Amino acid sequence: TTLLNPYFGEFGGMYVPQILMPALNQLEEAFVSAQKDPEFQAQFADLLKNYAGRPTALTKCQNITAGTRTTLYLKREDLLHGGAHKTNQVLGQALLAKRMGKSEIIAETGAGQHGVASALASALLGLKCRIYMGAKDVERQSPNVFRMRLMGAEVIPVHSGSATLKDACNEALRDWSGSYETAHYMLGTAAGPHPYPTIVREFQRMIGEETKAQILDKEGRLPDAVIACVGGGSNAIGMFADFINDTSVGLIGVEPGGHGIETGEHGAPLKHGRVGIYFGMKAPMMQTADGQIEESYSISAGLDFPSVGPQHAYLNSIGRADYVSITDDEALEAFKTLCRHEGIIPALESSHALAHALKMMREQPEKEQLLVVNLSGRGDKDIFTVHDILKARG
Amino acid sequence: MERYENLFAQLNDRREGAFVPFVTLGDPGIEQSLKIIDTLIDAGADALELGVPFSDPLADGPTIQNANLRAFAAGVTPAQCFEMLALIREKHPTIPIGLLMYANLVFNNGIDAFYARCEQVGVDSVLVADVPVEESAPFRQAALRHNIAPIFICPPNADDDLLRQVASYGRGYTYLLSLPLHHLIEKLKEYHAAPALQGFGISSPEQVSAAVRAGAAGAISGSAIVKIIEKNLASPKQMLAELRSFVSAMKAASRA
Ligand SMILES: [Cl-]
Ligand SMILES: [Cs+]
C-alpha cells in the first residue's frame, strides 16, 4: 500500500477522504524515486546554492553571552533568499511537481510567508500557482499578498469557518482532490498526511547537516543542545534530523506559550494539547473537550498551527527530544536583545527559540554549554508588530 | 437490527430504488432540524444520512460548510446530536439512520465508546469521511463489534484493489461517487458488495431514475436538501413545504 511507513510510533497516518489517496500514493512514489536520482539531487543542490544562498552562515554571538559560560551559535536561515527557512522545501516540492509532469501548484498560507515562498519557487520554475488564504489573514497581511501577486501567483481568500490557516488548509485540499492530475499541493510544514511529514523533513535536513559540519569545523565538538521553535515543525525537524543518532546532543523544540499556558491562549499542542485526528494525521492538537479544533495563539503569526508534525510527537514520547514553551513577553525580550547586542533582527518565531537559550544561559551562568539556535528567519516583517506593542507599553 | 437489509428487501419486491436525503443535525436550529427530519420521512425518504457538525470538514463543499456553521451558531454539540438521534429513533423505529462523521469526533472519547453510543441510540451505519479503507481497521472493527455497519465511499478514481476492499469491508450500502458507472455497479455486484447508492450530484428526479436504471439500488441527495434549507431560512413554513415537494418528487422518480 505504501513504500514507506506512514507512522512515527503511533502518530501520523493518511487520514484523508478516499478520493485523495491516489494523489498521496503517486506523490510518495515520485518522492522515493527522486531521492534515488542523482540528477534530481544535483538540480536541487544547484538551486539551493546558486539561487537561494546555501550554505547559510553559522554565527558565534560575541556580546550576548558575556558574563556566562554559554557559547551561542546562530544558524542563519534569515540569510536565505526570502528571509526564512521555508525556501528550502518549496524549491524541492516544485522540482518534485515538475518531475511528476505537473504544471500547477496549490498552497495554503496564514501569515503569508509560505505563500510568498510558494509564489517565488513557482515563478522561477514555470509553474502556475494559486494560493488560498483566510480572509482574516488576507487583510492582516496585505504586504505579503502584494508580494505574491507581484510574483504572478493567484491569491484566493477563504471566509469559511474561522477564515484562518486551518480553513485555508481545507479548501486547498478540496481543490487538489479534483485537480491532482495537473496540480501539486505544496504543503507548508512537516505535518499533514503521509508522505508530507517525511518529504518536508528531507527537503529541510540540510540545515542540520550544514550546522553539524560547521560546528565541528569551528569548535571541534558537537553542540550540547540545538534549539528551534516549533510551529508545524519543519524548521525544527530540519535542524534535528542529522543529530537524532548523536544521542549526546540535546534536541529542544520551543512551542509558543502565547499569553501563558495557564491562560489557555497559547500554541503549544505538543505538551498541552491532546491527541486527535485532523488534517490527515494522528497528532497532538488544540481541541475542545467535544473534539472541535481550536486556534493556536501566538504573537508570531508563523507559529499559528493548532497541531504539530507527527515525528515531533514521536520524538517527545520516546524522550529523544524535549519540548518547552516560551511566552510572548519572553520572545519579545529576546527579539530586543538580539538587535541591541548583535545587530540581528530575528523573526518573532525564531525569537522563541533564542528566548529559551537565553533562559538556559541565565538560569545557570556558570554552566559551560555549547548551544546552537536555528534562526529560522529575519524579523523585518515583524517590526511593525513589535513597534505597536512597545509604544502601547511605553 | 438490520434495517438496511429489510429496507432493500421490501424495495426490491416493489421494484423501487431508495431515496436518501442528507441533512446536518441541528441546522438551522435543534427544533427546526427535528421538524425537517420528520418532514423528510413523511414525504417518503427511505433512509436518512445525518451529519454531525464538525469544525474542520475538509471533505465537504461550501453548502455543507455553511450548514455546519448554522448548527454551531445554534449551539449544537455532539452530545445534543446523540440526544436528537434518540428522539428520531423513538418516533421512527424502522427507517435506517446513517451518520456522516469526521474521524476526530469518533476518536475523541474513544473509538469503541463512540460506536457503543451509536448502538445505544439505534444508529444503523457510520461513514467516517476522512478514514480511507487503508486506515479503517480500528473503526470498522469497533463498528462490527457494536452491530454498526461501516460505510465506505467508492470514488470515481477507484482501481480494482479498492473495489475488492470496499466490497469486503463495507456493510449496509456502498456510497458511490459518480471508469463507467454501469461497469462500477457490475464489478461491485460481482464482488458481492453491499447495494450501491449513487451519491454524486443527485438534484433532479431524472437523475434518481438514471441511477436505478444504471443498476444502483438508489440515490443520496448529498446537498440539494441543504440548499432548500439555505434558500428558505427566513420562512420556515415555506422551507418545509418545498422540502415536502422536492422529496416526494425525488421519491416518485425511484419507482421504475
Ligand atoms: Cl553564502
Ligand atoms: Cs504549534
In the DSSP assignment, the letter for residue A366 is T
What is the C-alpha separation between A381 and A346, in angstroms, rounded? Answer: 10
Q: Nearest CA to A125 among A164, A145, A153? A: A153
Half-sphere exposure (CA, 13 Å, Cβ side) for B22?
28
Measure the CA–CA gap between B157 and A274, rounded to whole angstroms: 35
- Kindly give, in sequence order, each residue whose CB lies less than 8 Å from that of residue B13, ignoring residues fewer than 6 positions away: none
User: Hey, are the CB atoms on A277 and B152 less than 8 Å from each other?
Assistant: no
Among residues B238, B189, B192, which one has the least CA distance to residue B216?
Answer: B189
A154-158: strand order across its sheet: A154-158, A128-134, A104-109, A183-185
Distance between A168 CA and the closest CA of chain B, angstroms: 10
Q: What strand order describes the sheet that includes A280-285?
A: A7-8, A11-15, A280-285, A274-278
CA dist., res. A274 & res. B169, Å (int): 30
Choosing among 3.20.20.70, 3.30.1490.20, 1.20.120.330, 3.30.70.270, the CATH entry for B2-256 is 3.20.20.70
Cα A125 to Cα A46: distance, rounded to the nearest angstrom: 13
Look at strands B48-51 and B18-24 and give their pairing.
parallel
Picking from A95, A36, A58, the residue whose alpha carbon sits closest to that of residue A207 is A58
DSSP output for A72-132: EEEEEGGGSTTSBTHHHHHHHHHHHHHHTT--EEEEEESSSHHHHHHHHHHHHHT-EEEEE
CB contact under 8 A, B155 and A277: no
What span, in angstroms and rounded, lies between the C-alpha atoms of A269 and A327?
14
The closest alpha carbon to A274, from A313, A303, A301, belongs to A313
**Number of residues that make up chain B:** 256
Sign of CA dihedral B51, B57, B61, B63: positive
CA atoms within 13 A on the CB side of A328: 19
Q: How many other C-beta atoms can be found within 10 angstroms of the C-beta atom of residue A205?
A: 18
Residue A103, CA distances (Å) to A99, A179, A223 in order: 10, 11, 43
Residues 159-198 of B with CB under 8 A from A: 159, 162, 177
Grid cell in block for residue B240: 418545509
Region of residue A167 (left: phi > 0; alpha: psi -120 to 50; beta: else)? alpha
Query: What spacing in Å lies between the alpha carbon of A237 and ligand 1's midpoint?
Result: 22
Determine the Cα angle at B182 with ends B179 and B187, to 5°: 80
B195: which residues sit within 8 A by CB, 6+ positions away? B4, B8, B173, B174, B216, B217, B218
| Cell 549526546, located at residue | A248
The Cα–Cα gap between A267 and A133 comes to: 20
Structure-block grid coordinates of residue B244: 415536502
Region of A9 please: left (phi>0), alpha (psi -120 to 50) or beta.
left
| DSSP at A54 | P
* Neighbour-count burial of A335, counting CB atoms closer than 10 A to its CB (0-12 exposed, 13-18 middle, 19+ buried): buried
- Encode chain B in three state secondary structure: CCHHHHHHHHHHHCCECEEEEEEECCCCCHHHHHHHHHHHHHCCCCCEEEECCCCCCCCCCHHHHHHHHHHHHCCCCHHHHHHHHHHHHHHCCCCCEEEEECHHHHHCCCHHHHHHHHHHCCCCEEEECCCCHHHCHHHHHHHHHCCCEEECEECCCCCHHHHHHHHHHCCCCEEECCCCHHHHHHHHHHCCCCCEEECCCCCCHHHHHHHHHCCCCEEEECCHHHHHHHHCCCCHHHHHHHHHHHHHHHHHCCEC
Q: What are phi and psi of B56, to 5 degrees?
A: -130, 75
* Experimental method, per PDB record: X-ray
Instruction: Tell me how far apart the alpha carbons of residues B154 and B161 are, in angstroms, rounded to a whole number.
Output: 11
At A128, phi and psi to the nearest 5? -75, 135
Residue A107's closest CA among A88, A123, A122? A122
Q: Identify the structural domains of chain A with CATH numbers, from first to last.
A: 8-52+86-204 (3.40.50.1100), 53-85+205-390 (3.40.50.1100)
- Which residues on chain A are in Cβ contact (under 8 Å) with B104? 276-278, 287, 291, 293
Question: How many angstroms separate the alpha carbon of residue A221 from the centre of ligand 1?
Answer: 23
Please give the distance of CA B253 from its chain centroid, rounded to a whole number: 19
B236-252 and B30-42 are packed helices; what angle lies between their axes, rounded to 10 degrees?
30
Given an 8 Å threshold on Cβ–Cβ distance, is B105 in contact with A18? Answer: no
CA A343 to centroid of ligand 1, rounded, Å: 19
In the annotation, is B60 catalytic? yes
What would the grid cell of residue A145 be? 499578498
SS3 A297: coil
Query: Is B242 annotated in the active site?
Result: no
Q: Which residue has the cell 543542545?
A: A225
Nearest to B227 by CA among B98, B101, B75, B64: B64
Contact between B56 and A13 using a beta-carbon 8 Å cutoff: no
Q: Which of A16, A160, A279 sits opposite B65 (nearest CB)?
A: A160
Q: Between the CA of residue B44 and those of A65, A306, B122, B251, what are the distances in Å? A: 77, 43, 20, 6
**Could you give the CA distance from residue B54 to residue B61 in angstroms, rounded to a whole number?**
13
Please provide residue A333's backbone torsions phi and psi, each rounded to the nearest 5 degrees: -60, -45
Q: CB–CB of B157 and A19 under 8 A?
A: yes
C-alpha to C-alpha distance for B127 and B57, rounded to whole angstroms: 13
Taking the C-alpha atoms of residue A226 and residue A72, their distance in angstroms, rounded to an integer, is 10
The answer to whether A27 touches A93, Cβ cutoff 8 Å, is no
CA distance A104 to A130: 8
Instruction: Please list every residue in chain A whose beta carbon sits closer than 8 Å to the beta carbon of residue B133.
Output: 18
> Cα–Cα distance between A196 and A232 in angstroms, integer?
12
C-beta separation of B25 from B50 below 8 A:
yes
Closest CA to B65 of A164, A295, A162, A155: A162
- How far is B66 from B58, CA to CA, in rounded Å? 13
Contact A204, A89 (CB under 8 A): yes
Alpha helices in chain A (DSSP H): 21-35, 38-47, 86-99, 113-125, 135-140, 142-150, 165-179, 196-202, 206-219, 234-240, 269-272, 310-317, 328-342, 348-363, 383-393
| Radius of gyration for chain B, computed over Cα atoms and rounded to the nearest angstrom | 17
Q: What is the CA radius of gyration of chain A?
A: 20
- Torsion sign over Cα A386, A335, A83, A105: negative
Hey, what's the cell of A64?
550576548
**B87 min Cα distance to partner chain A (Å):** 21
Across the interface, do B104 and A17 touch by the CB < 8 Å criterion?
no
Q: Please name the residue of chain A whose CA is at the shortest distance from the CA of residue B153.
A: A18
Task: Please answer whether residues A211 and A218 qualify as being in contact, where contact means their C-beta atoms are separated by less than 8 angstroms.
Answer: no
C-alpha grid cell, residue B178: 459518480
Whole-angstrom Cα distance, residue B247 to residue B245?
A: 6
Question: How many residue contacts between A and B have a Cβ separation below 8 Å?
Answer: 84
Contact B133, B165 (CB under 8 A): yes
What H or E segment, with its residue span, contains residue A228?
strand A225-229
Residue B201 neighbours by CB under 8 Å, 6+ apart: B178, B207, B222
User: How far apart, in whole angstroms, are the C-alpha atoms of residue B172 and residue B176?
Assistant: 13
A250-258 and B174-176 as β-strands: parallel, antiparallel, unpaired?
A: unpaired
CA distance B127 to A253: 37
User: Which one, of A201, A210, A166, A186, lies nearest residue A314 by Cα?
Assistant: A201
> Which residue type is seen at B34?
L
Gap between the terminal Cα atoms of chain A: 60
Measured in angstroms, the resolution is 2.2
For residue A161, report the phi and psi dihedrals to the nearest 5 degrees. Answer: 65, -140
Q: Which residues of B touch A17 (CB under 8 A)?
A: 58-59, 129-130, 132, 153, 155
